[PDB]
Design a protein around this motif. Structure first.
Motif, PDB file in Angstrom:
ATOM      1  N   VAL A  41      -7.123   0.697  -9.149  1.00 60.61           N
ATOM      2  CA  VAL A  41      -7.785   1.540  -8.927  1.00 60.61           C
ATOM      3  C   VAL A  41      -7.045   3.023  -8.293  1.00 60.61           C
ATOM      4  N   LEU A  42      -6.352   2.162  -7.466  1.00 57.51           N
ATOM      5  CA  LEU A  42      -5.615   3.768  -5.965  1.00 57.51           C
ATOM      6  C   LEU A  42      -4.189   3.398  -5.864  1.00 57.51           C
ATOM      7  N   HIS A  43      -3.691   1.770  -6.531  1.00 61.57           N
ATOM      8  CA  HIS A  43      -2.500   2.079  -6.176  1.00 61.57           C
ATOM      9  C   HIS A  43      -1.776   2.479  -4.591  1.00 61.57           C
ATOM     10  N   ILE A  44      -2.545   1.839  -3.975  1.00 68.36           N
ATOM     11  CA  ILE A  44      -1.927   2.791  -2.688  1.00 68.36           C
ATOM     12  C   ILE A  44      -0.793   2.352  -2.060  1.00 68.36           C
ATOM     13  N   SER A  45      -0.298   0.985  -2.347  1.00 67.56           N
ATOM     14  CA  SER A  45       1.443   0.480  -2.321  1.00 67.56           C
ATOM     15  C   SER A  45       2.322   1.077  -2.825  1.00 67.56           C
ATOM     16  N   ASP A  46       1.949   1.769  -4.136  1.00 66.39           N
ATOM     17  CA  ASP A  46       3.538   2.665  -4.458  1.00 66.39           C
ATOM     18  C   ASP A  46       3.529   3.846  -4.289  1.00 66.39           C
ATOM     19  N   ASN A  47       2.022   4.114  -4.321  1.00 62.40           N
ATOM     20  CA  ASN A  47       2.230   5.506  -4.049  1.00 62.40           C
ATOM     21  C   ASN A  47       2.270   5.707  -2.318  1.00 62.40           C
ATOM     22  N   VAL A  48       2.413   4.608  -1.638  1.00 62.42           N
ATOM     23  CA  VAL A  48       2.745   4.950   0.384  1.00 62.42           C
ATOM     24  C   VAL A  48       5.070   4.850   0.030  1.00 62.42           C
ATOM     25  N   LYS A  49       4.888   4.347  -1.155  1.00 62.19           N
ATOM     26  CA  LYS A  49       6.555   3.786  -0.914  1.00 62.19           C
ATOM     27  C   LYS A  49       7.314   5.282  -2.442  1.00 62.19           C
ATOM     28  N   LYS A  50       6.256   6.045  -2.749  1.00 57.69           N
ATOM     29  CA  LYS A  50       6.994   7.440  -3.057  1.00 57.69           C
ATOM     30  C   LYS A  50       6.887   8.104  -2.167  1.00 57.69           C
ATOM     31  N   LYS A  51       6.090   7.951  -1.558  1.00 56.91           N
ATOM     32  CA  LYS A  51       7.024   9.142   0.471  1.00 56.91           C
ATOM     33  C   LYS A  51       7.149   8.688   1.312  1.00 56.91           C
ATOM     34  N   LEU A  52       7.158   7.278   1.533  1.00 56.71           N
ATOM     35  CA  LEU A  52       8.837   6.658   2.154  1.00 56.71           C
ATOM     36  C   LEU A  52       9.767   7.286   2.336  1.00 56.71           C
ATOM     37  N   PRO A  53      10.390   7.702   3.435  1.00 60.76           N
ATOM     38  CA  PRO A  53      12.088   7.685   3.611  1.00 60.76           C
ATOM     39  C   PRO A  53      12.908   7.041   3.306  1.00 60.76           C
ATOM     40  N   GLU A  54      14.356   7.148   3.584  1.00 53.56           N
ATOM     41  CA  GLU A  54      15.094   5.585   2.833  1.00 53.56           C
ATOM     42  C   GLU A  54      15.254   4.640   3.875  1.00 53.56           C
ATOM     43  N   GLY A  55      15.549   3.315   4.005  1.00 54.62           N
ATOM     44  CA  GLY A  55      15.829   2.824   5.182  1.00 54.62           C
ATOM     45  C   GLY A  55      14.997   2.240   5.156  1.00 54.62           C
ATOM     46  N   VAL A  56      13.436   1.726   4.418  1.00 48.66           N
ATOM     47  CA  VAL A  56      11.643   1.520   4.490  1.00 48.66           C
ATOM     48  C   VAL A  56      11.599   0.545   3.984  1.00 48.66           C
ATOM     49  N   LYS A  57      11.788  -0.669   4.201  1.00 47.21           N
ATOM     50  CA  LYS A  57      10.835  -1.956   3.920  1.00 47.21           C
ATOM     51  C   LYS A  57       9.961  -1.826   3.666  1.00 47.21           C
ATOM     52  N   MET A  58       8.624  -2.920   2.734  1.00 44.47           N
ATOM     53  CA  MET A  58       7.682  -2.967   2.095  1.00 44.47           C
ATOM     54  C   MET A  58       7.036  -3.923   2.576  1.00 44.47           C
ATOM     55  N   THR A  59       6.124  -4.544   3.569  1.00 44.22           N
ATOM     56  CA  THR A  59       6.134  -5.652   3.004  1.00 44.22           C
ATOM     57  C   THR A  59       4.198  -5.685   2.633  1.00 44.22           C
ATOM     58  N   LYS A  60       3.985  -6.828   2.272  1.00 44.49           N
ATOM     59  CA  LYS A  60       2.763  -7.073   1.727  1.00 44.49           C
ATOM     60  C   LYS A  60       2.591  -8.699   1.777  1.00 44.49           C
ATOM     61  N   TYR A  61       0.970  -9.246   3.052  1.00 45.88           N
ATOM     62  CA  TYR A  61       0.992 -10.116   2.763  1.00 45.88           C
ATOM     63  C   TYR A  61      -0.581 -10.684   2.860  1.00 45.88           C
ATOM     64  N   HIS A  62      -1.056 -11.939   2.359  1.00 43.38           N
ATOM     65  CA  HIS A  62      -2.366 -12.179   1.981  1.00 43.38           C
ATOM     66  C   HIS A  62      -2.952 -12.933   2.846  1.00 43.38           C
ATOM     67  N   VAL A  63      -3.965 -13.601   3.535  1.00 45.10           N
ATOM     68  CA  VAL A  63      -4.765 -13.150   4.490  1.00 45.10           C
ATOM     69  C   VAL A  63      -5.268 -14.727   3.942  1.00 45.10           C
ATOM     70  N   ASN A  64      -5.929 -16.373   5.132  1.00 44.85           N
ATOM     71  CA  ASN A  64      -6.566 -17.326   4.988  1.00 44.85           C
ATOM     72  C   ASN A  64      -8.305 -16.753   5.003  1.00 44.85           C
ATOM     73  N   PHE A  65      -8.794 -16.046   6.017  1.00 42.07           N
ATOM     74  CA  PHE A  65      -9.799 -15.782   6.315  1.00 42.07           C
ATOM     75  C   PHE A  65     -10.786 -15.326   5.589  1.00 42.07           C
ATOM     76  N   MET A  66     -10.376 -15.351   4.047  1.00 42.77           N
ATOM     77  CA  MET A  66     -11.605 -15.199   3.260  1.00 42.77           C
ATOM     78  C   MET A  66     -11.006 -16.199   1.744  1.00 42.77           C
ATOM     79  N   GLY A  67     -12.445 -16.471   1.963  1.00 42.12           N
ATOM     80  CA  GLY A  67     -12.640 -17.464   0.525  1.00 42.12           C
ATOM     81  C   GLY A  67     -12.000 -18.954   0.939  1.00 42.12           C
ATOM     82  N   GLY A  68     -12.441 -19.206   2.451  1.00 39.56           N
ATOM     83  CA  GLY A  68     -11.887 -21.339   2.858  1.00 39.56           C
ATOM     84  C   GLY A  68     -10.685 -21.719   1.947  1.00 39.56           C
ATOM     85  N   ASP A  69     -10.932 -22.233   0.925  1.00 40.88           N
ATOM     86  CA  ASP A  69      -9.661 -23.147   0.711  1.00 40.88           C
ATOM     87  C   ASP A  69      -8.681 -22.485  -0.175  1.00 40.88           C
ATOM     88  N   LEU A  70      -9.596 -22.051  -1.284  1.00 43.05           N
ATOM     89  CA  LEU A  70      -8.788 -21.232  -2.101  1.00 43.05           C
ATOM     90  C   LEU A  70      -7.966 -20.597  -1.158  1.00 43.05           C
TER      91      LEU A  70
END
Length: 188
Positions: free
Chosen positions: A39-68
Protein backbone atom coordinates in the motif's frame (compact mmCIF):
# COMPACT_ATOMS: atom_id res chain seq x y z
CA UNK A 1 14.63 21.05 15.91
CA UNK A 2 12.18 19.85 13.30
CA UNK A 3 13.75 16.40 13.49
CA UNK A 4 14.33 15.17 17.03
CA UNK A 5 15.79 12.08 18.50
CA UNK A 6 12.85 10.16 19.97
CA UNK A 7 10.43 11.76 17.51
CA UNK A 8 10.90 10.60 13.91
CA UNK A 9 13.79 8.36 14.83
CA UNK A 10 15.73 7.04 17.82
CA UNK A 11 19.47 6.58 18.28
CA UNK A 12 21.14 3.29 19.10
CA UNK A 13 23.06 3.29 22.38
CA UNK A 14 25.46 0.81 20.85
CA UNK A 15 26.02 1.85 17.21
CA UNK A 16 26.84 -0.78 14.63
CA UNK A 17 30.10 -0.30 12.72
CA UNK A 18 30.35 -1.22 9.02
CA UNK A 19 26.59 -1.52 8.56
CA UNK A 20 24.63 -1.14 5.28
CA UNK A 21 23.76 2.48 4.76
CA UNK A 22 20.02 1.90 4.61
CA UNK A 23 18.93 -1.36 6.23
CA UNK A 24 15.35 -2.61 6.42
CA UNK A 25 13.90 -5.67 8.16
CA UNK A 26 10.57 -7.26 7.52
CA UNK A 27 8.69 -10.53 7.92
CA UNK A 28 6.12 -11.96 5.50
CA UNK A 29 4.00 -12.56 8.64
CA UNK A 30 4.27 -8.87 9.64
CA UNK A 31 0.99 -7.04 8.95
CA UNK A 32 2.51 -3.55 8.89
CA UNK A 33 5.18 -4.97 6.55
CA UNK A 34 2.36 -5.99 4.22
CA UNK A 35 1.06 -2.41 4.26
CA UNK A 36 4.65 -1.06 3.88
CA UNK A 37 5.11 -3.09 0.72
CA UNK A 38 1.65 -3.27 -0.89
CA UNK A 39 0.00 0.00 0.00
CA UNK A 40 2.75 2.41 0.96
CA UNK A 41 5.67 1.27 -1.23
CA UNK A 42 8.00 2.62 1.46
CA UNK A 43 11.16 1.04 0.16
CA UNK A 44 10.63 2.42 -3.29
CA UNK A 45 9.78 5.89 -2.10
CA UNK A 46 12.77 6.05 0.26
CA UNK A 47 14.87 5.16 -2.79
CA UNK A 48 13.45 7.92 -4.94
CA UNK A 49 14.77 10.44 -2.34
CA UNK A 50 18.12 9.00 -1.35
CA UNK A 51 21.40 10.64 -2.57
CA UNK A 52 23.64 8.97 -5.05
CA UNK A 53 26.07 6.32 -3.88
CA UNK A 54 23.39 4.83 -1.61
CA UNK A 55 22.79 1.12 -1.12
CA UNK A 56 19.53 -0.30 0.18
CA UNK A 57 19.51 -3.61 1.95
CA UNK A 58 16.34 -5.50 2.92
CA UNK A 59 16.40 -8.55 5.23
CA UNK A 60 13.81 -11.09 6.52
CA UNK A 61 13.59 -12.13 10.18
CA UNK A 62 13.05 -15.47 11.95
CA UNK A 63 11.12 -14.43 15.05
CA UNK A 64 7.67 -14.49 13.43
CA UNK A 65 5.86 -17.60 12.36
CA UNK A 66 8.15 -20.23 13.84
CA UNK A 67 9.28 -22.92 11.37
CA UNK A 68 7.78 -21.25 8.34
CA UNK A 69 9.38 -17.98 9.37
CA UNK A 70 12.78 -19.62 9.12
CA UNK A 71 11.82 -21.20 5.80
CA UNK A 72 10.85 -17.76 4.66
CA UNK A 73 14.25 -16.37 5.62
CA UNK A 74 16.10 -19.04 3.65
CA UNK A 75 13.71 -18.35 0.70
CA UNK A 76 14.35 -14.66 0.89
CA UNK A 77 18.09 -15.47 0.75
CA UNK A 78 17.35 -17.45 -2.48
CA UNK A 79 15.45 -14.47 -3.81
CA UNK A 80 18.48 -12.24 -3.14
CA UNK A 81 20.94 -14.68 -4.66
CA UNK A 82 18.89 -15.01 -7.88
CA UNK A 83 17.91 -11.34 -8.10
CA UNK A 84 14.22 -12.16 -8.10
CA UNK A 85 13.09 -10.08 -5.10
CA UNK A 86 10.69 -8.09 -7.23
CA UNK A 87 9.04 -11.16 -8.60
CA UNK A 88 8.21 -12.92 -5.37
CA UNK A 89 7.67 -10.21 -2.72
CA UNK A 90 4.04 -9.66 -3.53
CA UNK A 91 2.96 -13.32 -3.98
CA UNK A 92 4.73 -14.27 -0.77
CA UNK A 93 2.99 -11.55 1.23
CA UNK A 94 -0.41 -12.42 -0.26
CA UNK A 95 0.23 -16.14 0.11
CA UNK A 96 0.97 -15.84 3.85
CA UNK A 97 -1.48 -13.08 4.85
CA UNK A 98 -4.22 -12.71 2.19
CA UNK A 99 -5.03 -16.09 0.67
CA UNK A 100 -3.25 -18.29 3.27
CA UNK A 101 -1.96 -20.79 0.76
CA UNK A 102 1.56 -20.81 2.15
CA UNK A 103 1.86 -23.38 4.89
CA UNK A 104 5.08 -25.23 4.10
CA UNK A 105 8.39 -24.91 2.31
CA UNK A 106 6.83 -26.56 -0.71
CA UNK A 107 4.20 -23.85 -0.97
CA UNK A 108 6.91 -21.19 -0.70
CA UNK A 109 8.61 -23.00 -3.58
CA UNK A 110 5.42 -22.91 -5.70
CA UNK A 111 5.41 -19.11 -5.55
CA UNK A 112 8.86 -19.13 -7.19
CA UNK A 113 7.92 -21.76 -9.85
CA UNK A 114 4.84 -19.76 -10.71
CA UNK A 115 6.99 -16.64 -10.89
CA UNK A 116 9.12 -18.43 -13.48
CA UNK A 117 12.23 -19.51 -11.57
CA UNK A 118 13.12 -23.07 -12.53
CA UNK A 119 12.70 -26.01 -10.17
CA UNK A 120 16.28 -27.05 -10.58
CA UNK A 121 17.47 -23.48 -10.28
CA UNK A 122 15.50 -22.87 -7.08
CA UNK A 123 16.40 -26.16 -5.37
CA UNK A 124 20.13 -25.68 -6.10
CA UNK A 125 20.15 -22.10 -4.72
CA UNK A 126 18.07 -23.23 -1.70
CA UNK A 127 20.76 -25.80 -0.91
CA UNK A 128 23.79 -23.72 -1.82
CA UNK A 129 26.38 -22.45 0.68
CA UNK A 130 26.12 -19.03 -0.96
CA UNK A 131 22.57 -19.02 0.36
CA UNK A 132 23.59 -20.31 3.78
CA UNK A 133 25.93 -17.35 4.33
CA UNK A 134 23.22 -15.01 3.04
CA UNK A 135 20.87 -16.45 5.68
CA UNK A 136 23.69 -15.97 8.24
CA UNK A 137 24.04 -12.33 7.16
CA UNK A 138 20.33 -11.74 7.68
CA UNK A 139 20.56 -13.16 11.14
CA UNK A 140 23.80 -11.36 11.99
CA UNK A 141 22.43 -7.99 10.90
CA UNK A 142 19.30 -8.41 13.05
CA UNK A 143 21.23 -9.71 16.05
CA UNK A 144 23.58 -6.71 15.76
CA UNK A 145 20.82 -4.16 16.35
CA UNK A 146 18.75 -5.76 19.09
CA UNK A 147 15.90 -6.43 16.71
CA UNK A 148 12.63 -7.62 18.27
CA UNK A 149 10.17 -5.92 15.94
CA UNK A 150 9.39 -5.24 12.28
CA UNK A 151 9.03 -3.25 10.09
CA UNK A 152 12.35 -1.69 11.01
CA UNK A 153 14.79 0.55 9.21
CA UNK A 154 18.29 1.51 10.26
CA UNK A 155 20.44 4.25 8.76
CA UNK A 156 24.26 3.81 8.92
CA UNK A 157 23.86 1.48 11.88
CA UNK A 158 23.13 4.43 14.08
CA UNK A 159 19.56 5.64 13.61
CA UNK A 160 16.28 3.81 13.79
CA UNK A 161 13.18 5.12 12.08
CA UNK A 162 10.26 5.77 14.35
CA UNK A 163 7.11 5.70 12.28
CA UNK A 164 4.88 5.90 15.38
CA UNK A 165 6.03 9.52 15.67
CA UNK A 166 4.67 10.69 12.26
CA UNK A 167 1.15 11.71 11.10
CA UNK A 168 -0.93 8.79 9.75
CA UNK A 169 -3.95 10.90 8.87
CA UNK A 170 -2.90 10.76 5.20
CA UNK A 171 -0.95 7.83 3.78
CA UNK A 172 0.92 9.84 1.16
CA UNK A 173 1.99 12.36 3.74
CA UNK A 174 3.14 9.52 5.97
CA UNK A 175 5.42 8.06 3.26
CA UNK A 176 6.92 11.40 2.28
CA UNK A 177 7.58 12.23 5.93
CA UNK A 178 9.16 8.80 6.35
CA UNK A 179 11.31 9.16 3.28
CA UNK A 180 12.44 12.74 3.99
CA UNK A 181 13.42 11.48 7.43
CA UNK A 182 15.53 8.72 5.93
CA UNK A 183 17.19 11.36 3.76
CA UNK A 184 17.85 13.71 6.69
CA UNK A 185 19.33 10.79 8.66
CA UNK A 186 21.30 9.83 5.59
CA UNK A 187 22.98 13.24 5.43
CA UNK A 188 23.48 13.59 9.17
Amino acid sequence: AQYEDGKQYTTLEKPVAGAPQVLEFFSFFCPHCYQFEEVLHISDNVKKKLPEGVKMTKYHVNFMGGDLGKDLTQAWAVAMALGVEDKVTVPLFEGVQKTQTIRSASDIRDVFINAGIKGEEYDAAWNSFVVKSLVAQQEKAAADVQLRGVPAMFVNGKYQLNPQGMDTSNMDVFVQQYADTVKYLSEK
